[PDB]
Amino acid sequence: SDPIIVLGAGVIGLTTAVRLLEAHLGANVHILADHWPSDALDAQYASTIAGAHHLSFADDGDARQRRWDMRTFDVLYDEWKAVGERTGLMALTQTEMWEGATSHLAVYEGNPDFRVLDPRTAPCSNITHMVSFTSLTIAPTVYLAALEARVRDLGAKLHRAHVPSLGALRTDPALLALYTRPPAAVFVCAGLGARHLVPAPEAAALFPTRGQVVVVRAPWMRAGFTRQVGSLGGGEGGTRTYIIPRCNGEVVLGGTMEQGDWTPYPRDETVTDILTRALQICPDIAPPYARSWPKDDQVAALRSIVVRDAVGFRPSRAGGARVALASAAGMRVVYNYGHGGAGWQSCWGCAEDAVALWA
Amino acid sequence: SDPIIVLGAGVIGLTTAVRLLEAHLGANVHILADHWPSDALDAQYASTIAGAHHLSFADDGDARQRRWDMRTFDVLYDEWKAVGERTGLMALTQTEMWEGATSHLAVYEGNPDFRVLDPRTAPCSNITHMVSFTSLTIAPTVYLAALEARVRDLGAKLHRAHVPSLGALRTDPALLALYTRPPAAVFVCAGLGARHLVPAPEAAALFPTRGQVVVVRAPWMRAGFTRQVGSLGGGEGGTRTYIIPRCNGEVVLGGTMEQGDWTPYPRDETVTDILTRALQICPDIAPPYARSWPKDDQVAALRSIVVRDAVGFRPSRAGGARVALASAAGMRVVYNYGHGGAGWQSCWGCAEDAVALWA
Amino acid sequence: SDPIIVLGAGVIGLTTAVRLLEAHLGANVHILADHWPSDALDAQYASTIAGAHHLSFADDGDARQRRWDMRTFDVLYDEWKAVGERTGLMALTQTEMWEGATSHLAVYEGNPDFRVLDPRTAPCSNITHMVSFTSLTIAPTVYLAALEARVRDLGAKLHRAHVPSLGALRTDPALLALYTRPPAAVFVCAGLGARHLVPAPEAAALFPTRGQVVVVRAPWMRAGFTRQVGSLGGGEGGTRTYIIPRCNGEVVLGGTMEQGDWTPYPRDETVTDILTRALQICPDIAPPYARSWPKDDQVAALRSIVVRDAVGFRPSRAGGARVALASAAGMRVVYNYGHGGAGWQSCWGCAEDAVALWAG
Amino acid sequence: SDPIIVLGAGVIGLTTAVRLLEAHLGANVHILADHWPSDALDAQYASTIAGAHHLSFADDGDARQRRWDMRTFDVLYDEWKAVGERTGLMALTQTEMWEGATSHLAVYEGNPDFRVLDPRTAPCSNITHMVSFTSLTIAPTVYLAALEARVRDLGAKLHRAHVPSLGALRTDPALLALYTRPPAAVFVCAGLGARHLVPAPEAAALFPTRGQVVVVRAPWMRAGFTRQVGSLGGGEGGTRTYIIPRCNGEVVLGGTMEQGDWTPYPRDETVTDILTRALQICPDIAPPYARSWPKDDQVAALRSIVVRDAVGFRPSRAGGARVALASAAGMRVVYNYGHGGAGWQSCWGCAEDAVALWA
Numbered sequence A, B, D: 001s002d003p004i005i006v007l008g009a010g011v012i013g014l015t016t017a018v019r020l021l022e023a024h025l026g027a028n029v030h031i032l033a034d035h036w037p038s039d040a041l042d043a044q045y046a047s048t049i050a051g052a053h054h055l056s057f058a059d060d061g062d063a064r065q066r067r068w069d070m071r072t073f074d075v076l077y078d079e080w081k082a083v084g085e086r087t088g089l090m091a092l093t094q095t096e097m098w099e100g101a102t103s104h105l106a107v108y109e110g111n112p113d114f115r116v117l118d119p120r121t122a123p124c125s126n127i128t129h130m131v132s133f134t135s136l137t138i139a140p141t142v143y144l145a146a147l148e149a150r151v152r153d154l155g156a157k158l159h160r161a162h163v164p165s166l167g168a169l170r171t172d173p174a175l176l177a178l179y180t181r182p183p184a185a186v187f188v189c190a191g192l193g194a195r196h197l198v199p200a201p202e203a204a205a206l207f208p209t210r211g212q213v214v215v216v217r218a219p220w221m222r223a224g225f226t227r228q229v230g231s232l233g234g235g236e237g238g239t240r241t242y243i244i245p246r247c248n249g250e251v252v253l254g255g256t257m258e259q260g261d262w263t264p265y266p267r268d269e270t271v272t273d274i275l276t277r278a279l280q281i282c283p284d285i286a287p288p289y290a291r292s293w294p295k296d297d298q299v300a301a302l303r304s305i306v307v308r309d310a311v312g313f314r315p316s317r318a319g320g321a322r323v324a325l326a327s328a329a330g331m332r333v334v335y336n337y338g339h340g341g342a343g344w345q346s347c348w349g350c351a352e353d354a355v356a357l358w359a
Numbered sequence C: 001s002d003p004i005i006v007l008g009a010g011v012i013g014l015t016t017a018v019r020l021l022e023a024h025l026g027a028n029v030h031i032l033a034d035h036w037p038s039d040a041l042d043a044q045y046a047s048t049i050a051g052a053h054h055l056s057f058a059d060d061g062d063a064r065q066r067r068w069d070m071r072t073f074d075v076l077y078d079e080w081k082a083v084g085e086r087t088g089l090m091a092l093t094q095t096e097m098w099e100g101a102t103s104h105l106a107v108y109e110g111n112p113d114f115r116v117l118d119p120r121t122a123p124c125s126n127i128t129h130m131v132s133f134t135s136l137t138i139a140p141t142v143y144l145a146a147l148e149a150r151v152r153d154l155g156a157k158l159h160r161a162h163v164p165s166l167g168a169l170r171t172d173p174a175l176l177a178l179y180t181r182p183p184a185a186v187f188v189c190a191g192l193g194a195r196h197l198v199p200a201p202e203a204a205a206l207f208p209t210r211g212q213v214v215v216v217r218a219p220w221m222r223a224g225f226t227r228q229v230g231s232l233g234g235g236e237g238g239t240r241t242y243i244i245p246r247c248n249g250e251v252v253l254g255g256t257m258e259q260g261d262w263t264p265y266p267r268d269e270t271v272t273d274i275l276t277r278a279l280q281i282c283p284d285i286a287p288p289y290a291r292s293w294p295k296d297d298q299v300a301a302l303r304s305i306v307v308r309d310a311v312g313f314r315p316s317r318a319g320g321a322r323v324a325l326a327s328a329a330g331m332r333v334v335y336n337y338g339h340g341g342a343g344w345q346s347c348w349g350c351a352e353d354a355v356a357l358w359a360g
């Protein structure tokens, strides 16, 4: 009878709410957020800026991340087997190439059709290791719309509201009008927004890792490619070039990984950079008719098929995501934030842990 | 060189920004807001919920409100003579009727074509006083779109951003990324949202006055009607029924005046109440074919032409709007908020005062 | 059951089809047409070019036209009383002014709220007679869409097909594939296209009267105005200026009456003419903010609210419409064409006569 | 100064008009047609019903058809090299399978990347010959829109008009109003409509070959497949199953070849037939997630991605297309009609001959 709040309507909050409602049928759940999946794109809302591909960054020794990523893959892949592309999922061969390293992450061996490839067969030079396996991409707008429909069907009440502090959920008459009584519990799925909701030491742990992408219309591309330069360093370190094709024919090209960079608007030079690198790792990203042209001329061909530029801020945190049980303003609090560049590939895993902590 | 911030992209912020940029051509102006005019309607954003009509509530002794309301009428009426309905304005005869009173507000005598009518000619019973005069309605979405285009043309930079505190404008890296240097000044045009930005005693002076409206498609209606019940009490007291026709053929029917009511969703019984009262004061709101039908059948005819239901929170303030110079967080601050049910009819007057205070 | 063909999907064909299906006479109805109401506007398809208003041209001594026009008025007015504007109908006050004449048609006295006005109160000069009465306008696209839905609901089969001759309905495999069996009957509701379907010496009787109109967005205008110059001459003679407001806020301004003029495209000078004459007869057609300006500036204000120019060819015929039973190409034939500038205002009346002729 | 008429705005008329205006810049050209490319689909207008692919039917000894087909290929391929998919063209690998034949048409060897394949590798049974080569598909609505824009830019006047007889062009006031003076010449590109415009011996040569197609949304398919059953017989004989993918992700599945069948509406049993046969010759037409399912479940999966059913009448003629100079009703007449199922793959070839015959 006392309301349970899910604060956040990104992929993290919506998956949390789905698992919450499935575990406790008819529970009194209110989802509050100041940005919703179908809103216009905004650099501050990470979930619809994402590619998204399932391409784990889980260190061999990071048992929690490996578990989350593979659990999430299992859920998404079973869903694709059931409904195909209806919710924005597309199974595909993912190819990862390393420019330095002579190993892949052990976590990839859990995916179907894992193969070690000859690094000399990469289209770009200096590739020292190369693997492929079956994975999935997600058109986030489509998938999030499906999650929104699902939480409605499960009986969640949805509210557009800004929450200035966790205490406000108990005290602010504007918020109390939504759910009548002070909440018994809150799931804090506020992404990078959690910086304004937690005490100073925890707030300090959050930082943006800015990512710019270029979305092209390239429906000929139905395979995934990533080039990793530099060590992950047990986290999400180094830089990536990637080709992330969606089932709708939009293909996300990236990326950048700028720690502490709060600039929300795309940079012209980075557009050029992304297009140039995308052509290096995946020559077939070019419009078919332009593929025989000098490499320099193919950038303009890619420009001609650009759908949009986009920028987002990965909600980065030292040690990865905070999924933990605490207390604030007399409410039971479950934190589920700080997923960096891996929220889409870990969402269902985190959601299940979060609900288990609450329960 | 130092940025000047306009916080808010409602009618108050946008008129403030226009007058600011007109007074000081090429100034470094950045407009920050978490809700913009063309966004989907939300009860928290009053400017696009409003009717809006110019129907002053200024008490005979309220010299400041009278001056603002008359100034705003002059600006809007001048604009209508220059551009017609291009920006959402429509000149019309406004008829006001009182159920109890035997006097009107002196301020109305400043409008063109002021006439005292025979109250016995009102279509509803118990009317003791009635006047008409030339006034204007505004389709707020259209007018705000023109204001947005105008501030762009004048060189303002526009940002979608939430401001958690005034200090954050100078200290918060997420906001500093927008304009680089710490701002010298901020115009706080945050509407009811100002309650999160000011000290608790100022925040306590602000309260919502909830208003529900029904929008109908009634392009045959090109005249305005209001019935006042109870005393204004030197502010915006009592209750009103109104018919507010827009140039686009949508006609806003209302209303309610629920002080402290934070419920953002429409109430079914209130829909019935509004349609019933609308028919009382203006029989011609009914579709022409339905005008000879019994009263109950005519409510049904109005239901058949409903476009939308909407709810908004008027940013009411004890003593009316705060338009004042101050200092806070190392900035020169001009507050311009708390216009209640009168922001549209006072906007330009208030904007000119705000810019003068800053200058 | 042998097919019964309605040839034409203008207002005449569709009303004929509705009345045919409503007759419940076991008719296996196939509606064939090379232009359908929701198709792009084309000067050759009169029904969606029309204003349309109900403003009878029926001469005092033209009993058939008077009966048709008043019957159609009753049907449309009752429809408006039942459903309001849902099917594109709008009741309004129609004001007619004459430049020269000292009387009105008797037929108008049958409308609600009839009155003879003081012609000195007309906004333009040289007005010698003026009346008003309650009438209706029709947004033809909306009303025709409603008729199309209605014939579908009643079980008619609808086909996009060009009929090269009446005989072809029985003999042409391209047409026979639509309905399998040779048709027993055809209602020829082909409008000006009937010139290619009726025996050739009857075709000389049909001619275009070209009409250009300017459609403006003027939702403040919900009253109708017409000025008649010259005599009707027992038919549709002389020239008219008119303001015909639709329920959707589009207002049709006109008009021209160019006999034998087959030019399907709007003329620049005619746009200027129509706007100028519209302002003469109805000063409030101008945008409210423009009403105090010089006449030339008001013409410019009208140009600023133009939605579209359009041209149509009225299916004119000496003697008015042919509504008649015949036998041709082995089939029972009912002709229902040649309604000139009055198809909308006579449609239901004609449809009922046509169906009665077939039913025998 | 005397008008030149192009009668018809299908692919044949519009290519003729383009070549006409390019040869004689500023010429007084009027294009008359009762159906235009952007009109709603109609079984009587073949050009937008077509797949279309470039898959020649030209007999080894049919010099004219081979010349036409290869010239048209050259023109379209050059266009695709210049603009890619901008005008609806997509280069692809076309694979043809024969159920009986042990040879391919010689004309195919003129296409790039020609190769004879192992017929054992066909996914369906009883294949005895198989080849592939580079060819093109066309999204006809997009291509015809480009042609329409081209003729406008070259100064053609376009008219929606029905021509009851060629004599009417000189004598009918309804047609004379379009171009003022009796025309000097007419290019008769009326497709199957030519049967109403030519003398009884020439009209008897024309007949419909009805084809029904199913359009699916299958953007994973960018390769073309055809199975030929029975002999071409020096013409377009026998029956074909085909997969014709467009650049916009629509894929046309077919077909039927019913001579003299004037039924313009799709048959339910033919939908089933086409879907079943498409799956036989190209298992990858099925949604990726459905590819391991039993055959009946895959047919159902194809039904779920259906965009539209369509029917058209190929303008078939004894001896193929009539491209011929004549004199009728006072005019210099060039006939260019009766292209059967090969109008798209022969259009530019025929157009050029037609303009030459007139010049």
Ligand SMILES: Cc1cc2nc3c(=O)[nH]c(=O)nc-3n(C[C@H](O)[C@H](O)[C@H](O)COP(=O)(O)OP(=O)(O)OC[C@H]3O[C@@H](n4cnc5c(N)ncnc54)[C@H](O)[C@@H]3O)c2cc1C
Pocket: A007, A008, A009, A010, A011, A012, A013, A032, A033, A034, A035, A036, A044, A045, A046, A047, A048, A049, A050, A051, A052, A053, A054, A055, A161, A162, A163, A164, A189, A190, A191, A192, A193, A194, A196, A210, A211, A212, A213, A244, A255, A311, A312, A313, A314, A315, A336, A337, A338, A339, A340, A341, A342, A343, A344, A345, A346
């Ligand atoms: C360019 C780019 C590419 C990426 N690609 C991938 C990829 O391929 N695979 C992958 O797994 N991940 C990827 N990511 C990362 C992924 O997008 C994020 O980890 C994930 O979206 C974070 O989800 P979230 O729900 O925590 O945050 P968000 O999506 O930002 O949502 C937070 C929610 O909380 C609400 N909120 C916050 N504060 C408040 C408040 N005070 N009051 C009310 N509401 C509040 C917001 O309105 C919003 O609804 C990418 C990120 C970027 C930027």
Ligand SMILES: Cc1cc2nc3c(=O)[nH]c(=O)nc-3n(C[C@H](O)[C@H](O)[C@H](O)COP(=O)(O)OP(=O)(O)OC[C@H]3O[C@@H](n4cnc5c(N)ncnc54)[C@H](O)[C@@H]3O)c2cc1C
Pocket: B007, B008, B009, B010, B011, B012, B013, B032, B033, B034, B035, B036, B044, B045, B046, B047, B048, B049, B050, B051, B052, B053, B054, B055, B161, B162, B163, B164, B189, B190, B191, B192, B193, B194, B196, B210, B211, B212, B213, B244, B255, B311, B312, B313, B314, B315, B337, B338, B339, B340, B341, B342, B343, B344, B345, B346
């Ligand atoms: C039903 C109804 C009918 C009405 N009818 C009339 C009428 O007929 N005539 C009339 O004169 N008035 C009318 N009003 C009143 C009028 O709508 C308000 O007085 C006026 O819109 C207030 O404008 P504003 O710009 O102050 O507030 P708002 O429109 O609410 O805009 C405030 C802006 O501040 C931004 N903001 C606030 N806090 C923050 C933050 N922390 N960070 C970033 N951005 C922030 C918001 O995003 C928004 O852009 C009506 C009101 C209602 C509810």
Ligand SMILES: Cc1cc2nc3c(=O)[nH]c(=O)nc-3n(C[C@H](O)[C@H](O)[C@H](O)COP(=O)(O)OP(=O)(O)OC[C@H]3O[C@@H](n4cnc5c(N)ncnc54)[C@H](O)[C@@H]3O)c2cc1C
Pocket: C007, C008, C009, C010, C011, C012, C013, C032, C033, C034, C035, C036, C044, C045, C046, C047, C048, C049, C050, C051, C052, C053, C054, C055, C161, C162, C163, C164, C189, C190, C191, C192, C193, C194, C196, C197, C210, C211, C212, C213, C244, C255, C311, C312, C313, C314, C315, C337, C338, C339, C340, C341, C342, C343, C344, C345, C346
């Ligand atoms: C500018 C203008 C204003 C007007 N204003 C008014 C007004 O205010 N009030 C009023 O009452 N009337 C008005 N009219 C007149 C009215 O529009 C016509 O009288 C009426 O539309 C004629 O209807 P119809 O069905 O006979 O002809 P059409 O609407 O032309 O329809 C004829 C049908 O026959 C079909 N057809 C013809 N030949 C063939 C063939 N060979 N094969 C297959 N199909 C064929 C066509 O495709 C079409 O479906 C106006 C006309 C014009 C031009």
Ligand SMILES: Cc1cc2nc3c(=O)[nH]c(=O)nc-3n(C[C@H](O)[C@H](O)[C@H](O)COP(=O)(O)OP(=O)(O)OC[C@H]3O[C@@H](n4cnc5c(N)ncnc54)[C@H](O)[C@@H]3O)c2cc1C
Pocket: D007, D008, D009, D010, D011, D012, D013, D032, D033, D034, D035, D036, D044, D045, D046, D047, D048, D049, D050, D051, D052, D053, D054, D055, D161, D162, D163, D164, D189, D190, D191, D192, D193, D194, D196, D210, D211, D212, D213, D244, D255, D311, D312, D313, D314, D315, D337, D338, D339, D340, D341, D342, D343, D344, D345, D346
């Ligand atoms: C199902 C199907 C699949 C096909 N697939 C292919 C393929 O893959 N490759 C290929 O090469 N071909 C294909 N075709 C064949 C191709 O569609 C035709 O050969 C080609 O479209 C014929 O073009 P057209 O311009 O002659 O005829 P149409 O496109 O029918 O155009 C005739 C034009 O003449 C006009 N017209 C006719 N009579 C008159 C008149 N009396 N007055 C005014 N205007 C008139 C019409 O309005 C129209 O504008 C296919 C056909 C079908 C039915």
Ligand SMILES: [F-]
Pocket: A162, A163, A164, B162, B163, B164
């Ligand atoms: F906040």
Ligand SMILES: [F-]
Pocket: C162, C163, C164, D162, D163, D164
């Ligand atoms: F014809």
